Amino acid sequence: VSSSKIASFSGTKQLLDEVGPKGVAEWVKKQDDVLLTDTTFRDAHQSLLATRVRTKDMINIASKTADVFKDGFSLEMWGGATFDVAYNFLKENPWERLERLRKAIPNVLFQMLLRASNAVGYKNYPDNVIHKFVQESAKAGIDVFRIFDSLNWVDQMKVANEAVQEAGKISEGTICYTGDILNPERSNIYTLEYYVKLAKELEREGFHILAIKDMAGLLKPKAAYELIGELKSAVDLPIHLHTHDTSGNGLLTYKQAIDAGVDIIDTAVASMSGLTSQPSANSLYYALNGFPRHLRTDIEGMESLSHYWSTVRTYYSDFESDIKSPNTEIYQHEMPGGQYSNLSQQAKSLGLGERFDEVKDMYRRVNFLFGDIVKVTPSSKVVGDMALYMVQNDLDEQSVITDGYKLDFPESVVSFFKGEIGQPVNGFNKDLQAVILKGQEALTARPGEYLEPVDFEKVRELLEEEQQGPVTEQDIISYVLYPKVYEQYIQTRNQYGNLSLLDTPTFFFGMRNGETVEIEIDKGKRLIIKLETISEPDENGNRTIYYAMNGQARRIYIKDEN
Amino acid sequence: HKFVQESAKAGIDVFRIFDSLNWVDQMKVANEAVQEAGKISEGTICYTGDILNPERSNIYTLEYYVKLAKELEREGFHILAIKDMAGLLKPKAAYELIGELKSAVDLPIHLHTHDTSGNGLLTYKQAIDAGVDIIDTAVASMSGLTSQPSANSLYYALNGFPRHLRTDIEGMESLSHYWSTVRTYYSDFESDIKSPNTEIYQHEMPGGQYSNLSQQAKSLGLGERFDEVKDMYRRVNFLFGDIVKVTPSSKVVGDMALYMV
Amino acid sequence: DKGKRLIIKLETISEPDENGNRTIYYAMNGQARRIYIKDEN
Amino acid sequence: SGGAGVRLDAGDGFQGAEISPYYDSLLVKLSTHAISFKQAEEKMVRSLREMRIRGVKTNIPFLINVMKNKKFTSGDYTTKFIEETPELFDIQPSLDRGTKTLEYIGNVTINGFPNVEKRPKPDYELASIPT
Amino acid sequence: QIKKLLVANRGEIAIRIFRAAAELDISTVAIYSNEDKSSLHRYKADESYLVGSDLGPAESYLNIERIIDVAKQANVDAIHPGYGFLSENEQFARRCAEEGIKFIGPHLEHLDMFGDKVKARTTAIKADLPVIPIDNPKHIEVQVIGDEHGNIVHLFERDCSVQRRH
Ligand SMILES: O=CCCCC[C@@H]1SC[C@@H]2NC(=O)N[C@@H]21
Ligand SMILES: [Mn+2]
Ligand SMILES: [Mn+2]
Structure with a gap:
């Protein structure tokens, strides 16, 4: 228009x-x-x-x-x-x-x-x-x-x-x-x-x-x-x-x-x-x-x-x-937004891909554990990280207190219980919180x-x-x-x-060989780039690119990464 | 029977x-x-x-x-x-x-x-x-x-x-x-x-038809003017007197639309 | 010949094209020089 | 070209332009300049003979062939010149070694030699040659 | 008083003028056809525009109307036509002034004064020079540069007698 x-x-x-x-x-x-x-x-x-x-x-x-x-x-x-x-x-x-x-x-x-x-x-x-x-x-x-x-x-x-x-x-x-x-x-x-x-x-x-x-x-x-x-x-x-x-x-x-x-x-x-x-x-x-x-x-x-x-x-x-x-x-x-996918591409990177089921299930439970919270970034990351951890360590609503002293909870959770993301609507379970902070205020x-x-x-x-x-x-x-x-x-x-x-x-x-590409700079003035060929690699592994930029023949050196 | x-x-x-x-x-x-x-x-x-x-x-x-x-x-x-x-x-x-x-x-x-x-x-x-x-x-x-x-x-x-x-x-x-x-x-x-x-x-166009009909429009030479085919499909409906479109009647109109562009 | 001689660098040879022709890029006595070779099989 | 008395105005030629059949083919405008007219001519012929344009035919040789002509050097020439000088068209292509040798090397490099198996290229003793 | 310049042309004369223009501190526009996307002359100005996807190879440099938008689009205020498309053309010239754009050529009356054959003949006789009927002919031409102030010198002759038919 x-x-x-x-x-x-x-x-x-x-x-x-x-x-x-x-x-x-x-x-x-x-x-x-x-x-x-x-x-x-x-x-x-x-x-x-x-x-x-x-x-x-x-x-x-x-x-x-x-x-x-x-x-x-x-x-x-x-x-x-x-x-x-x-x-x-x-x-x-x-x-x-x-x-x-x-x-x-x-x-x-x-x-x-x-x-x-x-x-x-x-x-x-x-x-x-x-x-x-x-x-x-x-x-x-x-x-x-x-x-x-x-x-x-x-x-x-x-x-x-x-x-x-x-x-x-x-x-x-x-x-x-x-x-x-x-x-x-x-x-x-x-x-x-x-x-x-x-x-x-x-x-x-x-x-x-x-x-x-x-x-x-x-x-x-x-x-x-x-x-x-x-x-x-x-x-x-x-x-x-x-x-x-x-x-x-x-x-x-x-x-x-x-x-x-x-x-x-x-x-x-x-x-x-x-x-x-x-x-x-x-x-x-x-x-x-x-x-x-x-x-x-x-x-x-x-x-x-x-x-x-x-x-x-x-x-x-x-x-x-x-x-x-x-x-x-x-x-x-x-699970707000992408998370459901952002959090399975992650449950696989930890050999849990095969039981994202139990992970979906822990997310819900964790939410009631952290006392029923609004789950947008970054509170959704707190709840997610806790679900992963808790599935992976075979953890329980009760195990998280009982065994919490030796536990080592993911940063993003310690940080939630530390107040660093603000105050939830329903406060913190004080005992849940003690076991996660391990002393810090x-x-x-x-x-x-x-x-x-x-x-x-x-x-x-x-x-x-x-x-x-x-x-x-x-x-x-x-x-x-x-x-x-x-x-x-x-x-x-x-x-x-x-x-x-x-x-x-x-x-x-x-680009690909034979390709010509225009890059618009100002109105009416563009970089015309066309790729003549790509060479074989020299001794220190540099391939030479043969361009014709704006008609002018031109030559660039790129280190091949293998 | x-x-x-x-x-x-x-x-x-x-x-x-x-x-x-x-x-x-x-x-x-x-x-x-x-x-x-x-x-x-x-x-x-x-x-x-x-x-x-x-x-x-x-x-x-x-x-x-x-x-x-x-x-x-x-x-x-x-x-x-x-x-x-x-x-x-x-x-x-x-x-x-x-x-x-x-x-x-x-x-x-x-x-x-x-x-x-x-x-x-x-x-x-x-x-x-x-x-x-x-x-x-x-x-x-x-x-x-x-x-x-x-x-x-x-x-x-x-x-x-x-x-x-x-x-x-x-x-x-x-x-x-x-x-x-x-x-x-x-x-x-x-x-x-x-x-x-x-x-x-x-x-x-019923069901999947408008992507078949788009395959077809390409497998010919009309992919760029597909906007013209959609338009003809419509017009070809009234040409044919305004008709129900399900198989096989919808193919008829698609076939006609291809033909006319 | 006596004190005239051709200096040729073959810099690169290109992947072929539909017509079936490779492009050879050289340098010759101080000149950029491009050549079309047909590739039989 | 370049140097004494030469002027060049770019047209279609460079690097690796495709020239098309759509317009007047004009690659370079070449003008030369000296105090004598003969001297400008022998300047033109230097310059023409320097040009290398490859991938297309050009009119250079014809142009060389008008420059060299006594009847153009004489100055006394009429628009009937080219028509009543048939030998302007007498054009031998010389044995452009350089080009041919690149064609040969290219050809062998890509399609190898008849009776000869594709191996890593010899000249593989740095013991040069007694003389 | 010219801040930028469009050349209704291509190739050597385009480049040639681009250079003149650069010398006078003038921003320049080039036009191209689809066949000239990679012609030298597209590269040698500051500004480059397509005369329009839908315009053929011949048409591109001959569409009075279409060239002039490129102009108005680029806040241009002068066009040099060079030679050999719309440089002799009476309508293109007229159009330019109308759009506020300055035509680098003689005045409107000159183009059709000289552009037709039969009319050139009349003009010359009105200032009497020779004409009527040619043995061992020589083709001679005289360069003239006149301003818009009735100051009109000549730059001596040339000798274009070396030709094949056209
Ligand atoms: O087909 C193989 C590449 C062409 C090599 C040509 C050389 S020239 C001398 C010798 N005589 C031939 O018939 N071929 C090789
Ligand atoms: Mn949102
Ligand atoms: Mn159904």
């Missing part, structure tokens, strides 16, 4: 400019139609393709997405696993993704998923790291921050909320769904009144939008009716539903939440949707025909977007999961409290001394989040440059 | 009888064979068009199906079957269609759909509120996309709603796991489809 045409659209982006965060929410509330947030750029491929999708594949349909989602509520396109992965595996800069997309899709709000304690990081950070990250993310184009917490501990959500409010952007306060409100015997704790009392709380904390995060796709169709009906009379906040289709019940849940008055839902493009992804927006659009509320979208554009991602998804087939059918066992174990306050503020001065002078000189705010905050992984990006970038410009089949597979 | 008799004898109890153009006069012969064999005769209506949408057809209306159902009740089928061979039955439509027929005819209603749009389950949900007696499902690992909607899924989907599926889920998860492995032996034969697809509503 032409940039001229895109320059003329007004959507939720320029709404935020004119009326501010409280004005956007107000305006969500008055819409009859269900508004949609597309998740193709984050959660769709985070679930289906190990977060591997590359900027280049997104940049390519950005102008079509700007047109197609013009009436969307937001594009969820940053956060989750995408920061780390981009730097680490794709060896590309997730800030360049943010800013290049920002320019191409000027019209629709940008959403990211922001974990309360540590943003997008992997450990715990002092408060001035959270603030720095949100300052810079907002500057770079993020408009809606979906602040969530692994354990639904509200105290841990405040710092991020403050940041977003200061940035003048939209904070969504997230509740994560577990248990089953349809079933009194599932749980005492995770009852309908518990969600109400916690909605009512996030609202007193100033969040503009309320999000129900159903991360293990556990929210049954009727429960979605009940839950959203109660929340809508319990609070003034627009409600924004997020779920996964892993049970195969994603659409029905979305339908029911719609009958019950939900404001925004998260869907994906068809080709990128379903099973562990979100339910398909293309399907829902048709599913609502002849019911009271309509999905606000362009299906013709969506069918066209889906065709694009059909082909691109092909580029990523080495990263597909085994999962090829819905799974209703999730209702028993509650638990935290009282939220983890971040205990942390020396970071000194960005020292970081800047360390990067400038390492790199040539001139270093930016994004660089500095990136390094604080991912020290090792950031340094590995610079080294890679010195050796090889800006690789996010290659297309994906070239980035993963290289 | 010789086939129904032998079939009965050998253990078949329920015959679902359909015609590829919904021509009742062509079903009477198999029905008489089934009646004579003391077995259950299921009278199939194939769904096309789209009864929510008056623009779609003056012909395939709620009234066409009601009329067609009573005619089947008169020839003495014991069950009424709705074959949604392409999964064209949108949720609200199933609710409305099962409604009418439950007050039109004293026949139990048996519903068969395919999950190719992604809405299969939603359809069954809706038909169930409308009074429907039997639905077609498959185990989870054998379901989805161009197959039936998942029995396991439907089971938990209906928690808190008035009716429920009469089945054993824990047994189903077991069935599911077994087939999940077996499916593996058959990988060389796996559909190319991996997504739900709502263009189904515009071109109406």
